[PDB]
Design an enzyme around this catalytic site. Structure first.
Site, PDB file in Angstrom:
ATOM      1  CG  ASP A 118     -40.272 -16.080   6.893  1.00 11.63           C
ATOM      2  OD1 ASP A 118     -39.122 -16.369   6.340  1.00 11.63           O
ATOM      3  OD2 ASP A 118     -40.646 -15.917   7.966  1.00 11.63           O
TER       4      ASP A 118
ATOM      5  CG  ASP B 191     -43.558 -19.910   4.772  1.00 12.22           C
ATOM      6  OD1 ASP B 191     -42.493 -19.663   4.169  1.00 12.22           O
ATOM      7  OD2 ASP B 191     -43.882 -19.646   5.848  1.00 12.22           O
TER       8      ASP B 191
ATOM      9  NE  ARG C  38     -29.773  -0.294   2.710  1.00 10.31           N
ATOM     10  CZ  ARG C  38     -28.802   0.349   2.507  1.00 10.31           C
ATOM     11  NH1 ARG C  38     -27.817   0.143   3.384  1.00 10.31           N
ATOM     12  NH2 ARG C  38     -28.684   1.323   1.955  1.00 10.31           N
TER      13      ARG C  38
ATOM     14  NE  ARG D 188     -38.399 -16.387   9.858  1.00 13.37           N
ATOM     15  CZ  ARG D 188     -37.967 -17.347   9.625  1.00 13.37           C
ATOM     16  NH1 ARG D 188     -37.077 -18.005  10.712  1.00 13.37           N
ATOM     17  NH2 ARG D 188     -37.848 -18.175   8.451  1.00 13.37           N
TER      18      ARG D 188
HETATM   19  C1  LIG Z   1     -42.154 -16.733  14.078  1.00 17.09           C
HETATM   20  C2  LIG Z   1     -43.224 -17.039  13.658  1.00 17.09           C
HETATM   21  C3  LIG Z   1     -43.762 -18.243  14.174  1.00 17.09           C
HETATM   22  N1  LIG Z   1     -44.324 -16.066  14.066  1.00 17.09           N
HETATM   23  C4  LIG Z   1     -45.097 -15.334  13.155  1.00 17.09           C
HETATM   24  N2  LIG Z   1     -45.971 -14.549  13.903  1.00 17.09           N
HETATM   25  C5  LIG Z   1     -46.832 -14.060  13.239  1.00 17.09           C
HETATM   26  N3  LIG Z   1     -47.729 -13.219  13.672  1.00 17.09           N
HETATM   27  N4  LIG Z   1     -46.745 -13.926  11.920  1.00 17.09           N
HETATM   28  C6  LIG Z   1     -46.006 -14.636  11.026  1.00 17.09           C
HETATM   29  O1  LIG Z   1     -45.653 -14.580   9.943  1.00 17.09           O
HETATM   30  C7  LIG Z   1     -44.920 -15.501  12.004  1.00 17.09           C
HETATM   31  N5  LIG Z   1     -44.060 -16.258  11.332  1.00 17.09           N
HETATM   32  C8  LIG Z   1     -43.073 -16.881  12.031  1.00 17.09           C
HETATM   33  C9  LIG Z   1     -42.126 -17.766  11.458  1.00 17.09           C
HETATM   34  O2  LIG Z   1     -41.570 -18.571  12.054  1.00 17.09           O
HETATM   35  N6  LIG Z   1     -42.035 -17.846  10.092  1.00 17.09           N
HETATM   36  C10 LIG Z   1     -41.384 -18.704   9.380  1.00 17.09           C
HETATM   37  C11 LIG Z   1     -42.256 -19.653   8.718  1.00 17.09           C
HETATM   38  N7  LIG Z   1     -41.633 -20.795   8.063  1.00 17.09           N
HETATM   39  C12 LIG Z   1     -40.891 -20.411   6.831  1.00 17.09           C
HETATM   40  C13 LIG Z   1     -40.519 -21.625   6.171  1.00 17.09           C
HETATM   41  C14 LIG Z   1     -39.790 -22.561   6.877  1.00 17.09           C
HETATM   42  S1  LIG Z   1     -38.024 -22.259   7.130  1.00 17.09           S
HETATM   43  O3  LIG Z   1     -37.599 -23.423   8.472  1.00 17.09           O
HETATM   44  O4  LIG Z   1     -37.931 -20.839   7.762  1.00 17.09           O
HETATM   45  C15 LIG Z   1     -37.088 -22.496   5.692  1.00 17.09           C
HETATM   46  C16 LIG Z   1     -36.898 -23.995   5.161  1.00 17.09           C
HETATM   47  O5  LIG Z   1     -38.026 -24.652   4.915  1.00 17.09           O
HETATM   48  C17 LIG Z   1     -38.116 -25.496   3.769  1.00 17.09           C
HETATM   49  N8  LIG Z   1     -39.549 -25.499   3.499  1.00 17.09           N
HETATM   50  C18 LIG Z   1     -40.421 -26.758   3.485  1.00 17.09           C
HETATM   51  N9  LIG Z   1     -41.675 -26.503   3.126  1.00 17.09           N
HETATM   52  C19 LIG Z   1     -41.747 -25.089   3.049  1.00 17.09           C
HETATM   53  C20 LIG Z   1     -42.825 -24.487   2.123  1.00 17.09           C
HETATM   54  N10 LIG Z   1     -43.957 -25.158   1.941  1.00 17.09           N
HETATM   55  N11 LIG Z   1     -42.532 -22.864   1.729  1.00 17.09           N
HETATM   56  C21 LIG Z   1     -41.411 -22.632   2.227  1.00 17.09           C
HETATM   57  N12 LIG Z   1     -40.302 -23.082   2.530  1.00 17.09           N
HETATM   58  C22 LIG Z   1     -40.506 -24.606   2.824  1.00 17.09           C
HETATM   59  C23 LIG Z   1     -37.252 -24.754   2.732  1.00 17.09           C
HETATM   60  O6  LIG Z   1     -36.773 -25.580   2.200  1.00 17.09           O
HETATM   61  C24 LIG Z   1     -36.063 -24.065   3.865  1.00 17.09           C
HETATM   62  O7  LIG Z   1     -35.425 -25.184   4.002  1.00 17.09           O
HETATM   63  C25 LIG Z   1     -40.586 -22.992   8.150  1.00 17.09           C
HETATM   64  C26 LIG Z   1     -40.978 -21.805   8.930  1.00 17.09           C
HETATM   65  C27 LIG Z   1     -41.970 -22.449   9.976  1.00 17.09           C
HETATM   66  O8  LIG Z   1     -43.116 -22.130  10.009  1.00 17.09           O
HETATM   67  O9  LIG Z   1     -41.346 -23.101  10.792  1.00 17.09           O
END
Ligand SMILES: CC1(C)Nc2nc(N)[nH]c(=O)c2N=C1C(=O)NCCN1CC[C@@H](S(=O)(=O)C[C@H]2O[C@@H](n3cnc4c(N)ncnc43)[C@H](O)[C@@H]2O)C[C@@H]1C(=O)O
Ligand SMILES: [Cl-]
Length: 158
Positions: free
Chosen positions: A95, A97, A82, A92
């Protein structure tokens, strides 16, 4: 190609978000799920006033190009639920990834693979080790060696 996808959520019922995402991933064209890790409860990396995360890893066999796979994971993030929250440093809602795309390296405006920080994140490496203990990264580094050296705490189950 075997893609390894990291799934995370700490909002809007993480178990519901992850189950819905896995169902949607399995229905991506030209793709199917080979294995899923256990579901883990992990403390937030970053700001501490936010709920614990559900983290998992999933091996997905696919004949899609990497950018095509990303189009689908981003579509799922938009179609599901939603409300979407994707704040820098959290929280989040969902996500998806692309941690690894076969043994390929990709560095475009849209896609960086391997995930740029996964070697510093126990909540990504431990679920991956559960499903691919013998994995070697594109630079030649062994996953088991990283876990030995960094001594990341093991994870509790959701
Ligand atoms: C808060 C935090 C740190 N704390 C956590 N703590 C625990 N315990 N557990 C967690 O899970 C956890 N998670 C956390 C978290 O921050 N999560 C988000 C991780 N992640 C998601 C994707 C990208 S993004 O900026 O959201 C979107 C863009 O990225 C581009 N993009 C480039 N390469 C990509 C790829 N290989 N796959 C997907 N998209 C990709 C795409 O084109 C988009 O424009 C970078 C971001 C990161 O890591 O900074
Ligand atoms: Cl690498």
């Amino acid at each position: 190609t075997v893609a390894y996808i990291a799934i995370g959520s700490n909002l809007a019922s993480p178990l519901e978000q992850v189950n819905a995402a896995l169902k949607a991933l399995g229905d991506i064209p030209e793709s199917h799920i080979l294995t899923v890790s256990s579901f883990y409860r992990t403390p937030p990396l970053g700001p501490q006033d936010q709920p614990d995360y559900l983290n998992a890893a999933v091996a997905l066999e696919t004949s899609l190009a990497p950018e095509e796979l990303l189009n689908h994971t981003q579509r799922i993030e938009l179609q599901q639920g939603r409300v979407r929250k994707a704040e820098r440093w959290g929280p989040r809602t969902l996500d998806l990834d692309i941690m690894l795309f076969g043994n390929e390296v990709i560095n475009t405006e849209r896609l960086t693979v391997p995930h740029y920080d996964m070697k510093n994140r126990g909540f990504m490496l431990w679920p991956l080790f559960e499903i691919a203990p013998e994995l070697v990264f594109p630079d030649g580094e062994m996953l088991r060696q990283i876990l030995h050296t960094r001594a990341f705490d093991k994870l509790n189950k959701w």
